[PDB]
Design a protein around this ligand. Structure first.
Ligand SMILES: [Fe+3]
Ligand SMILES: [Fe+3]
Lengths: 511, 133, 392, 166, 387, 73
């Protein structure tokens, strides 16, 4: 026998993977769908279990090595501005729940596949999204270990249900990826959610965190982004497989438009608010980043070059562009108006931030700075004044509504973005909608959207009762987790909120 | 020149940005044939960028633009960008396959595939206009 | 230079560092520095596995063990919820009580898999270098291995593919990990069988590594016929995830796969002078034991011993167990006819050896699973029912 | 009002649930409860924030009542109203296929979900039928999505406008 | 507490002011002057080569002058009188596997963890019920236990080599080989201890293996050979050639591979092959480095070819006679096992001996001019076989 | 047979390390020395060729990861 040292590379094993599947009568998908995937489809990246495990092991080693050796010795925990820590408190948890739901969407995509290579690629994604969830949890754990404000970092999974933004996040990530057609979930998670929004999210978070003195997020977030490269390859691969079928040409454009609008309606207002209003040193205005990463990169390379098949620019691009410039501010107003219901500390803009906002966004001053200065003059920060902006908004005639479809707070009087308030009555129930696309979605399929908004659940209940029931207090049992300032003194208590005497009024009853 | 990070509208601020952003002709997606590659900043990536991308790739593709960010490299180019893992293995003096290179790679806006020991990225549509091998 | 202005990091820039140091308070605002201190620990003290895994899935209150409130924001067409109690028959007070005895999350898992992969590569290189393939039985190499060890990978692939529904419809976070890991183990076993066949082909000239003959044997030969049917009944027959896990990992696998991998290939490989198959059967056995621990913890402890839903779950468990045990016996009876294609060896190939192996397998299954849920089984009846298909 | 997790509405309903001792009575109770309070076409909205918990309790009680007065064959291949599971699926599939408008198919699907949902019907039989009905429903609703004007769509749905900002 | 110079504002400002803007040298390759064996310089050569300070009067030196402190009587710390072989450059040896500390410890840790997991799984499944009674009771308990003393002696043989070597990669190769030998011995005991733990009535004590190693005739001659290498000689080149190239590659290969592994498989053992695979891998890894050192560097020297070849041939013939005597003494164990056609009869033993001797002839002997005929040796060994 | 998950701890292997040596006529040191060491000396920090590898691998991974990723960025 020839005696020479030889081995087997993963390429030879992967070459024989296509013939692992045999066909029988009951070989069909287990979920409702409208398309039919192609029998044979190639895979851009050739990976097996061994190779995937080796790559993931390598990455995990350096990351956990640097995080637990270098920054720990350098004392990087207490070298972060408090505002960025408060922002991370929300960002890490939200990203974790998004990754966790991405786990389930990929399995449904794995189930819906028909070729062995596709199942392998989907199986890889399932394993990665699990890794990403654990990494976000580790970021939260490390911040809880070394930061100077542990509260809100160690029990985020329990106190995050009080806030209003939670409902919106659950719609775009908790329910937007595991509901509807198997393909609907593909386009909603890979072609749009991962290739159009997470790219700017991860790169901008790493840029702003570095600018603000943070070093854990640059270390871990950039790792998470590496796996995504393949994820987009899987998304492209399924798009072509369902293509060239008679059904695709009748539903793909509608599916893409709905997914793009659903996703943008939440990230555009949220990310801009969390970036501009939650940092001390600012890199660049959010609208410029949105134009750089969404309108010119995704649209010019992904949607633009897909002219080959029947894909056209979404019909709702004009409304998205209009909302890019003012929505972050509109949402920030409402977020400041309801500070006690959150789980992070907030700070009002100061003179330098006001000057920056006026320079970058003309007309910001006369509309928002006057409101902010009034709020500051009426004791927004001191516990004694007993002032809550919600009562001021209610007494001054403005109202806060929640869209039934998108679940995003909306103030019609103080809004400069697109959309308008519509109230409908159906089966003795009143619904509020804020845009045309959401109204069409609700009118077409009214059985999918039946969630309870914030005000119905807490109707006729005083604020201190709600906060205490939701475990939104510190270790001493009487200090709130959320504060209206980032200073270390003069913290609000439950008695201050009790003296404020707020009560939810059910705004829809006036019609 | 046109592949810079701040090109065209980005070079405009204040009212100029406001008026050109809401322009009639800018409300429709325009097709582009560029590729964007974000690379994580580490000991190997520095070597590859300094010795291969800025030396050979620039010679083959004169339109490659490299931007140094806070913690990553942002490379925008026309056509395609190809990297060979064998050259990196010879350069670094340690064993190095395409998988080890994929470890560092952070993000891509285009179609990327690995063939043999070569990792490449291109704007060309694959499957639709070219059969993968 | 570059068009974009270079960003100055706040950790090293003097002015930014001074401002940040001025802003940071001099004392901590809280004393609790434990991540998720409210999680009930299974063992003496909270572990990193429990902290990172538990309570990840946001579940409403009407689902047992939930914390959030309200309905789901978006649902399927017609109103089917994204997750609900209608996806399974078994009931429980809490869905967050399951803990993996191995305490496995992503990093140790991938580390162990990488270790095994690199060790396998080194062993293959050394074995090729030393030329130990010469001392092998020719008939066993070219007539049994290439024809049936390459057909077992289709069973492995079917058992792997059965896990997608469990991965999507599962209602807790800890269980979603165990199922994914189990599925990855199965597909890894299939890929080894293929890699071993390719490696053998690369050494001995005239050896064919194609999968045409194994596929034809799997889909046409009577020996595997019955077994094939069982796999289909698990792959697409059912949609309940609890039933899928119980039928594919506690009844069918623990008998048929154990007998096929351990009692026939692993033993006769040694008996006929083969030094390569045991190296892979060892990995298969290790993966099976690791999966078995988690499956036993999930079913025997959390579900079958529920304080209030004990008998209700036990009834369904017995109902599934009898049916799938009947199917597994029929598969074993169909498979045991392979013994006529090998040379007779006293005590390993005659009727007594087969009877002893069947008794060992059935006794192990009775001790491990049947006695825990109250099932009644008599080994002699199953043993001679299987041996009824044995030809002398 | 009352706390989210502990309200009298729940105590009362649980107390009245606890006195059930037969399969048919429990089936009638659960069907009436599902028809009354568990659809967008529900008769009353007063029990909006507590109906899912009560439905869960009813399901648990009915499941406990089962597996004690029924055989294994009844538990597997027979519905709880005494009818074979397979026929029901065929009949409802035919009924959905005979539908001609997108407003009747959704009504048929909603009625089927309200009537035959576990533990009334076996899980596998239900899931298969649900997927089969959903396929047809989706196919019907996703044709000419943007053709109808908004006002005509409002007229077709039947809602009445209370406030409409300019 | 302590003010670090990387984060303190004033210190960072001072350091930034002091540091110049442009680099002063354009050569950023560590140890660029080392001649690369392969196409490009690697980290192994960069970190390993030229680490030992050697004067010019030692071949391939860089320093100058005598050693500062010598042994009483003027014996030099490292001299040319410690070996018989001569060369024009002692810095030419390169490990084919390119092994330095980190990859080596990584591989060993990988193997240890996998062994622990496999042992746990095997104990859980209780697969020991299929083992043969006779094979487990006598052969594994006694002779497998006795083999570890041979392993330990071969391991101890490397002590003088580390202190006398005149290079810096040869030292690493010798240390790694010794660690592999001691690892093999520890496993033979770990396996014995595990078997004792599982099956009741099985003794894990080393008294019987020691008795058999020191008194039983079967190993007797073999034991003598080990002593001849442990304390008989002091030349490190001769020690490495006798221990690895001649004695091990014949006797240890036949014992571990041709007897224990093959018969263990034949008699239905599923534990021993797992432990012998690691020993085989270690032997192959060591053999690669030994062959590289002795064939490419010394036997093919452009100035001292025949000089080195003469000593190599003399040592080869002497230790081959010793190894043949050891094998002839050892081949008498076949009378204690049940007869199996093609494995225990004369034909099987003859075929195994021919295979082993042909493999040696191909791998080591033909590279240094040695002349050997396999049929004669095979007959000489089989003359001590009881038919 | 007893079927319980058990393993072999390195202590058990190190316990029998004393008996691995056997004596003979020429079992003496090779270099010149003025002292003779005891034949029954125990050693603290009992280790084998596996614990050392594990510990060294862990330390090397920790330091090489930090050095090659954090300080470099
Ligand atoms: Fe992800
Ligand atoms: Fe992803």
């Amino acid at each position: 026998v020839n005696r020479a040292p030889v081995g087997v590379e993963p390429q030879e094993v992967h070459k024989w993977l296509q013939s692992f599947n045999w066909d029988f009568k009951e070989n069909r998908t287990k979920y409702a769908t409208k398309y039919h995937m192609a029998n044979q489809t190639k895979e851009q990246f050739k990976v097996i279990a061994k190779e995937y495990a080796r790559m993931e092991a390598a990455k995990d080693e350096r990351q956990f090595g640097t995080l637990l050796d270098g920054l720990t010795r350098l004392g990087a925990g207490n070298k972060v501005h408090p505002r960025w820590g408060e922002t991370m408190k929300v960002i890490s948890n939200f990203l974790e729940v998004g990754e966790y739901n991405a786990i389930a969407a990929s399995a449904m995509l794995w189930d819906s596949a028909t070729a062995a290579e596709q199942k392998n690629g989907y199986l890889a994604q399932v394993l990665d999204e699990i890794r990403h969830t654990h990494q976000c949890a580790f970021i939260n754990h490390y911040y809880s270990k070394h930061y100077h404000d542990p509260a809100g970092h160690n029990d985020a999974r329990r106190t995050r249900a009080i806030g209003p933004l939670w409902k919106g996040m659950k719609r775009v990530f908790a329910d937007g990826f595991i509901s509807g057609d198997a393909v609907e979930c593909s386009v909603n998670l890979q072609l749009v959610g991962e290739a159009c929004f997470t790219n700017p999210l991860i790169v901008a978070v790493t840029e702003w965190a570095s600018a603000n003195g943070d070093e854990i997020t640059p270390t871990v977030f950039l790792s998470v982004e590496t796996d995504e490269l393949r994820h987009m390859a899987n998304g492209y691969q399924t798009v072509v497989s369902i293509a060239n079928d008679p059904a695709a040409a009748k539903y793909l454009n509608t599916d893409l438009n709905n997914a793009f609008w659903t996703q943008q309606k939440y990230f555009t207002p949220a990310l801009g608010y969390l970036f501009e209003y939650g940092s001390k040193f600012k890199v660049e205005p959010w609208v410029k980043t949105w134009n750089r990463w969404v309108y010119e990169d995704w649209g010019g390379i992904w949607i633009g070059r897909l002219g080959k098949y029947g894909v056209e620019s979404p019909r709702s691009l004009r409304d998205a562009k209009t909302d890019a410039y003012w929505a972050h501010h509109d949402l920030a107003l409402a977020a400041y108006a309801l500070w006690p219901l959150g789980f992070a500390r907030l700070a009002l803009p100061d003179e330098e931030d006001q000057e920056w906002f006026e320079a970058n966004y003309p007309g910001w001053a006369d509309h928002y700075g006057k409101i902010y200065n009034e709020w500051k003059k009426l004791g927004y920060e001191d516990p004694k004044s007993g002032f809550i902006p919600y009562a001021w908004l209610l007494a001054n005639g403005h109202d806060v509504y929640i869209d039934r479809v998108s679940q995003v707070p909306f103030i019609p009087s103080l809004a400069k973005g697109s959309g308008s308030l519509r109230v409908h009555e159906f089966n003795g129930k009143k619904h509020s909608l804020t845009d045309d696309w959401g109204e069409r979605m609700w009118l077409s399929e009214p059985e999918r959207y039946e969630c309870h908004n914030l005000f119905e659940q807490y109707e006729g209940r005083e604020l201190s009762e709600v906060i205490a029931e939701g475990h939104g207090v510190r270790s001493d049992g009487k200090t709130l987790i959320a504060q209206p300032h980032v200073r270390g003194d003069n913290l609000w208590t439950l008695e201050d909120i009790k003296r404020a005497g707020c009560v939810f009024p059910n705004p829809l009853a006036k019609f | 020149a046109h592949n810079a990070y701040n090109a065209g509208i980005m070079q405009k601020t204040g009212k100029a940005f406001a008026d050109e952003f809401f322009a009639e002709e800018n409300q429709v997606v325009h097709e582009s044939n560029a590729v964007v590659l974000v690379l994580m900043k580490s000991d190997e990536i520095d070597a590859i960028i300094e010795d291969m991308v800025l030396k050979g790739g620039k010679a083959k593709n004169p339109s490659i633009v490299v931007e140094d960010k806070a913690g990553f490299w942002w490379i925008k180019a026309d056509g395609a960008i190809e990297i060979d893992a064998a050259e990196a293995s010879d350069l670094l003096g340690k064993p190095f396959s395409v998988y080890d290179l994929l470890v560092n790679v952070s993000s891509t806006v285009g179609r990327a595939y690995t063939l043999g020991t070569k990792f490449t990225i291109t704007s060309e549509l694959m499957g639709l206009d070219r059969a993968l091998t | 230079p570059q068009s974009s202005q270079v960003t100055k990091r706040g950790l090293t820039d003097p002015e930014r560092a001074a401002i940040i140091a001025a802003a940071v308070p001099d004392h901590a605002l809280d004393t609790q520095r434990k991540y998720h201190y409210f999680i009930q620990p299974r063992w003496k003290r909270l572990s990193e596995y429990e902290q990172l895994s538990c309570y990840a899935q946001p579940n409403p209150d009407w689902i047992a063990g939930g914390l959030d409130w309200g309905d789901w924001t978006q649902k399927f067409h017609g109103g089917r919820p994204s997750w609900g109690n209608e996806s399974t028959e078994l009931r429980t007070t809490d869905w967050y009580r399951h803990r993996d005895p191995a305490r496995r999350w992503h990093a140790p898992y991938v580390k162990d898999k990488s270790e095994e992969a690199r060790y396998t590569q080194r062993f293959l290189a050394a074995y090729s270098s030393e030329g130990s393939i010469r001392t092998i039985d020719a008939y066993w190499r070219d007539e049994i291995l290439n024809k049936y060890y390459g057909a077992l990978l289709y069973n492995e692939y079917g058992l792997f593919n059965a896990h997608s529904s469990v991965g999507r419809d599962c209602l807790s976070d800890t269980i979603r990990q165990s199922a994914t890991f189990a599925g990855l183990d199965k597909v890894d076993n299939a890929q080894m069988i293929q890699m071993e066949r390719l490696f053998i082909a690369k050494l001995v000239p005239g050896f064919d590594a194609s999968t045409d003959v194994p596929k034809k044997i799997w889909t046409t030969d009577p020996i595997y016929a019955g077994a094939r049917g069982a796999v289909e009944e698990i792959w697409q027959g059912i949609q309940d995830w609890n039933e899928i896990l119980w039928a594919g990992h506690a009844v069918y696998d623990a008998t048929f796969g154990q007998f096929a991998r351990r009692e026939f290939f692993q033993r006769l490989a040694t008996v006929y002078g083969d030094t390569l198959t045991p190296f892979f059967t060892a990995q298969s056995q290790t993966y099976f034991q690791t999966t078995r621990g988690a499956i036993e913890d999930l079913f025997v402890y959390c579900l079958a011993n529920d304080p209030e839903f004990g008998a209700h779950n036990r009834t369904f468990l017995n109902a599934w167990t009898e049916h799938y045990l009947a199917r597994s016996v029929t598969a074993l009876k169909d498979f045991v006819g392979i013994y006529a294609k090998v040379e007779k060896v006293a005590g390993a190939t005659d009727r007594a050896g087969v009877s002893e192996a069947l008794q060992r397998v059935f006794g192990d299954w009775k001790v491990d699973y049947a006695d825990k849920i109250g099932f009644n089984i008599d080994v002699d009846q199953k043993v001679d029912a299987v041996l009824a298909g044995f030809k002398n | 009002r009352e706390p989210i997790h502990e309200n009298s509405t729940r105590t009362e309903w649980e107390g009245k649930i606890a006195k059930l001792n037969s399969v048919d009575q429990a089936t009638k109770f659960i069907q009436d409860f599902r028809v009354a309070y568990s659809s967008p076409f529900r008769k009353s909205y007063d029990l909006d924030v507590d109906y899912q918990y009560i439905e869960r309790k009813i399901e648990e009680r009915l499941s406990v009542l089962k597996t004690e007065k029924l055989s294994v064959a009844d538990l597997v291949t027979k519905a709880t109203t005494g009818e074979d599971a397979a026929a029901v699926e065929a009949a409802w599939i035919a009924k959905m296929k005979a539908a001609e408008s997108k407003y009747a198919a959704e009504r048929i699907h909603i009625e089927f979900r309200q009537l035959y949902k576990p533990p009334v019907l076996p899980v596998n039989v239900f899931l298969r039928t649900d997927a089969a009905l959903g396929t047809i429903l989706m196919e019907l609703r996703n044709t000419d999505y943007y053709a109808t004007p908004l006002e005509g769509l409002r007229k077709e749905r039947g809602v009445k406008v209370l406030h409409l900002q300019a």
